[PDB]
């Protein structure tokens, strides 16, 4: 029972912290009108998408993995699977949105004055949410309880997802891991690379540059594992499941969700301009 006891402690802690962090960022950024800058529009959007990711991924992956059957109805398997992919998708384009905005402001300061506005930020927010809700539509369609029976002769289920053939399954998993992880991570490596280079070309500058390196590291550590696993299963579902099913994939998933825990820390709480906003937001 030790591995289950650790697994519930880890998930419940990371859940409570990701709820608290994102809801505080949402709170302090809505109350303080002063803190309403192009960047803080993306941080508010990001914190909402991370709050959805926390609420709809974490408990609904934990509880079935503890019970060893999917306890909720087909409507819950459909609805959760939609919001999981939706929240994961919006976040990865809000993190590539913050890196390309920061790069325009820091490496081309005059030219960006033409377009970098609060209205332009809200165009990119609206386009990102709408295109995420759009492309994730297969999830509530082809995600339906699949039945089996336990050794106690109880009927049991496992929520799963299946395009109509294996070529569609493989091409789909290749598309999501090359447009919701790979390129989103090579454009955050070249954006924060160029910002670090031009910024370094001194103690404050080195304090900035180590944060830019930590951001591109934490992105690849959270997401590479889960996006590579899904691709493994879509090719040899049998070998992938024989290796990773049960306890191992639950930690690859926890590592993925830990992104929605760290984002409030590295983007908000590490800057007192917001930390004071916090001190100004509450009595």
């Amino acid at each position: 029972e030790w591995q289950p006891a650790v697994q519930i402690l880890l998930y419940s802690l990371i859940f409570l912290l990701s709820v608290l962090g994102n809801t505080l960022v949402i709170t302090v950024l809505i109350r303080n009108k002063r803190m309403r800058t192009v960047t803080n529009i993306f941080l508010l959007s990001l914190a909402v998408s991370d709050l959805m990711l926390c609420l709809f991924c974490m408990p609904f992956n934990l509880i079935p993995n503890l019970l060893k059957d999917f306890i909720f109805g087909s409507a819950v398997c459909k609805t959760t699977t939609y919001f999981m992919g939706t929240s994961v998708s919006v976040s990865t384009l809000n993190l590539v949105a913050i890196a390309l905005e920061r790069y325009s402001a820091i490496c081309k300061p005059l030219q960006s004055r033409v377009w970098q506005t609060k209205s332009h930020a809200l165009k990119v927010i609206a386009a990102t949410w709408c295109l995420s809700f759009t492309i994730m539509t297969p999830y509530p369609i082809y995600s339906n309880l699949v039945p089996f029976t336990k050794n106690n002769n109880q009927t049991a289920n496992m929520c799963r997802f299946l395009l109509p053939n294996d070529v569609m399954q493989q091409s789909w998993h290749t598309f999501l891991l090359l447009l919701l992880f790979f390129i989103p991570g090579v454009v955050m490596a070249v954006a924060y690379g160029l910002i670090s280079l031009e910024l370094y070309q001194l103690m404050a500058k080195k304090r900035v540059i180590r944060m830019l390196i930590v951001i591109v590291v934490l992105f690849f550590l959270c997401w590479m594992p889960i996006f590579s696993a899904n691709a493994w299963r879509a090719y040899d579902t049998a070998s992938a499941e024989r290796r990773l099913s049960g306890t191992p994939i639950s930690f690859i998933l926890l590592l993925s969700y830990t992104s929605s825990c760290v984002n409030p820390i590295i983007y908000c709480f590490m800057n007192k301009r917001f930390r004071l906003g916090f001190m100004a937001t509450f009595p």
Partner: peptide, 8 residues
Amino acid sequence: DYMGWMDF
């Protein structure tokens, strides 16, 4: 038995 995993 319970095998595989949801995508996210």
